[PDB]
Amino acid sequence: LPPGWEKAMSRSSGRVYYFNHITNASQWERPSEPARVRCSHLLVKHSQSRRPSSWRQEKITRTKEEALELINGYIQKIKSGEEDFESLASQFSDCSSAKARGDLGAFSRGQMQKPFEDASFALRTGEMSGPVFTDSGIHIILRTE
């Protein structure tokens, strides 16, 4: 299996699935490094974020647990097709990159907060992470290039 994958079993159904402990992605199918990658993200900040403020809200007071619930809801809507990643990033990301549909542009190793870097480089082109935790908050990451 590609970098970071393990076989698991659904607790609700018993069917095998795959989980990546670097990106926090999970998928039903058996999964299918670059010098630079391009990613977009959606950040949900919380009260313990390094800087608990964003363009959305001057004082961010939500708990980390509440932030994770929000992230999980956005992931659901993105996976179902009810909403686009880009639309949710524009509306709800606690980062000024929201104004660019979450796009951060291209970057190499040695630039980003480490859990974000590692997730970004472990994603395949077009793939989306699960919740990724950094000192900034909790991210959904989409690798675009």
Partner: peptide, 5 residues
């Protein structure tokens, strides 16, 4: 700045 090291 967010989310740079």
């Amino acid at each position: 700045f967010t989310x740079a090291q």
